[PDB]
């Protein structure tokens, strides 16, 4: 026996549905949602870290001229300076008073610490979905866990469940993201091989264990000072350090709809969009025949208090007469009122008590207890506190919901004005007939 329902995507609020099969007693179910997760597909592009500069000892050749050759290492440079005259702690280095020369060189490498401090660039694609549910079944709690599409079925206590698909495809991620130790940012990084001297991406590599490195920093050598031996240079500072000081706020603090974000693996948790359909199959052994259930013959209703707040602020008292002891279900027949209890116990001649929640100013609703109906009515007062810490447990109201007193005044005014037009219309018709006939 198949049954289909639809529930909105909100966490922490229970819902109820009614199953009615001819020949058997009605049965009421309750469901509550505990988590929803989305997870995209990722591919890696490159990584970035700090860099290091390597400079060997200079070469001083006196009474001669030096020269240098080219090499293939990244950011290589060589220069030759004339007219030098170094000093040391013991005196002058070389005899000749002129025609001395100095040679200098340097190149750029990749730092060793890149295996612990690095950032990574990705591309994102379509995501999947998963969910977790709690169901009250046959007087006990059970849990189910499944994928949110039509391609999965689970069986708990001889019952099948199918969840999904979802009604919306909204995702908080763009095509390009960048990840760093628990934080995710949206960024449009420069392409591979097109870095800049002082921004994010001046040095690049394909994987932390690669040997190929691309670098686009500036390196210019300078003339040494008189009487000293050293190798000065000019170079733009690192770009990865600057980004750590100027990155700003991450997605966890800016994302819409109240989503949460975790990074191992990258996921989004508890985003409130749309609704989820559900399908359930119940075996024949779970029902009770109508001849065996007790019957109820006389009903009454009395309500002593009502305040239409966001919590359960009603109380009702119902009297009954029952044929024999057993169980029964309770269910509301209006959409504006919700009832907490699912089952009640009946015996002999007694009374039972229930509680409810509503947003209507004037209350009128019906209650079903084992194939019988009863009518209740009341007047409700407003609350006194302004702000709470939990969402409402009732539905919103429409334009047709109006207090009983207010409805009476509109009828009187509309009727009174309408009568004047009616009496005027009859007079005009009588006169017009006499003119037409007499001529």
Q: Which residues bind ligand NAG (CB under 6 A)?
A: 115-116, 141, 181
Binding to a second copy by residue 126, rule CB under 8 A? yes
Q: Which residues of 87-110 are buried (b: 16+ CB within 10 A; e: fewer)?
A: eeeeeeeeeeeeebbbebbbbbeb
Binding to other proteins by residue 384, rule CB under 8 A? yes
| Shortest Cβ 227–ligand NAG spacing (Å) | 46
For β-strands 203-204 and 183-186, DSSP reports them as: unpaired
Could you tell me which of 252, 247, 274 has the C-alpha nearest to residue 173? 252
User: Could you give the C-alpha distances from 329 to 15, 25, 176, 316, 333, in angstroms and in order?
Assistant: 15, 9, 54, 16, 13
Choose, by CB under 8 A, the member of 126, 385, 418, 427 that binds other proteins.
385
If contact means CB under 5 to 8 A according to the sort of partner, which of other proteins, ligand NAG, a second copy, none does residue 151 touch?
A: a second copy
Choose, by CB under 8 A, the member of 89, 95, 390, 436 that binds other proteins.
390
**Rounded to an integer, what distance in angstroms lies between the CA atom of residue 208 and that of residue 363?**
68
Cβ atoms 47, 208 nearer than 8 A: yes
Choose, by CB under 8 A, the member of 406, 419, 432, 433 that binds other proteins.
406
Binding to a second copy by residue 155, rule CB under 8 A? yes
**Rounded to an integer, what distance in angstroms lies between the CA atom of residue 383 and that of residue 288?**
43
Nearer to a second copy, 6 or 153 (CB): 153
If contact means CB under 5 to 8 A according to the sort of partner, which of a second copy, other proteins, ligand NAG, none does residue 115 touch?
A: ligand NAG
Cβ atoms 63, 97 nearer than 8 A: no
**Rounded to an integer, what distance in angstroms lies between the CA atom of residue 100 and that of residue 250?**
58
Could you tell me which of 425, 399, 52, 47 has the C-alpha nearest to residue 219? 52
| Shortest Cβ 141–ligand NAG spacing (Å) | 4
Binding to other proteins by residue 377, rule CB under 8 A? no
Choose, by CB under 8 A, the member of 379, 419, 432, 433 that binds other proteins.
379
What is the chain's Cα-based Rg?
A: 41
Binding to other proteins by residue 383, rule CB under 8 A? yes
If contact means CB under 5 to 8 A according to the sort of partner, which of other proteins, a second copy, ligand NAG, none does residue 154 touch?
A: a second copy
The residues of the shown chain that bind other proteins, judged by CB under 8 A, are 253, 258, 308-310, 361-362, 379, 382-392, 403, 405-406, 409
The residues of the shown chain that bind a second copy, judged by CB under 8 A, are 41, 43, 45, 125-126, 150-155, 160, 191-194
């Amino acid at each position: 026996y198949e049954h289909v329902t639809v529930i909105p995507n909100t966490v922490g609020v229970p819902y109820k549905t009614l199953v009615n099969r001819p020949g058997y007693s009605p049965m009421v179910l309750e469901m509550e949602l505990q988590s929803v997760t989305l997870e995209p597909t990722l591919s890696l592009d490159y990584i970035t870290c700090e860099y290091k500069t390597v400079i060997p000892s200079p070469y001083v050749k006196c009474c001669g001229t030096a020269e240098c050759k080219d090499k293939s290492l990244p950011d290589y440079s060589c220069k030759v300076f004339t007219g030098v005259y170094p000093f040391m702690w013991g005196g002058a280095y070389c005899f000749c008073d002129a025609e001395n020369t100095q040679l200098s060189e340097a190149h750029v490498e990749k730092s060793e610490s890149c295996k612990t401090e690095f950032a990574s660039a990705y591309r994102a694609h379509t995501a999947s979905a998963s969910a977790k549910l709690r169901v009250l079944y046959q007087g006990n709690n059970i849990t189910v866990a499944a994928y949110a599409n039509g391609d999965h079925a689970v069986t708990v206590k001889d019952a099948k469940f199918v969840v999904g698909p979802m009604s919306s495809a909204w995702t908080p991620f763009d095509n390009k993201i960048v990840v760093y130790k628990g934080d995710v940012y949206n960024m449009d990084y420069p392409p591979f091989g097109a870095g800049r001297p002082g921004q994010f991406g001046d040095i690049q590599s394909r994987t932390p264990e690669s040997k190929d490195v691309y670098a686009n920093t500036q390196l210019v050598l300078q003339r040494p000072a008189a009487g000293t031996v050293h190798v000065p240079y000019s170079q733009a500072p690192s770009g990865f350090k600057y980004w750590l000081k100027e990155r700003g706020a991450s997605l966890q603090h800016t994302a819409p709809f109240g989503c949460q974000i975790a990074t191992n693996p990258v996921r989004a948790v508890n985003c409130a969009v749309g609704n989820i359909p559900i399908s359930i199959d119940i075996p024949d052994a779970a029902f009770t025949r109508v001849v065996d259930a007790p019957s109820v013959t006389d009903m009454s209703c009395e309500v002593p208090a009502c305040t239409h707040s966001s919590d359960f602020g009603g109380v009702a008292i119902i009297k009954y007469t029952a044929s024999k002891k057993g169980k029964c279900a309770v269910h509301s027949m209006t959409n504006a009122v919700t009832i907490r209890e699912a089952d009640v116990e009946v015996e002999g001649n007694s009374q039972l008590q229930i509680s409810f929640s509503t947003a209507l100013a004037s209350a009128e609703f019906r209650v079903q207890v084992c194939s019988t109906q009863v009518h209740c009515a009341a007047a409700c007062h407003p609350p006194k506190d302004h702000i709470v810490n939990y969402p409402a447990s009732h539905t919103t109201l429409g334009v047709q919901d109006i207090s009983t007193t207010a409805m009476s005044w509109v009828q009187k005014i509309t009727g009174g004005v309408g009568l004047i037009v009616a009496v005027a219309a009859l007079i005009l018709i009588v006169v017009l007939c006499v003119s037409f006939s007499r001529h």
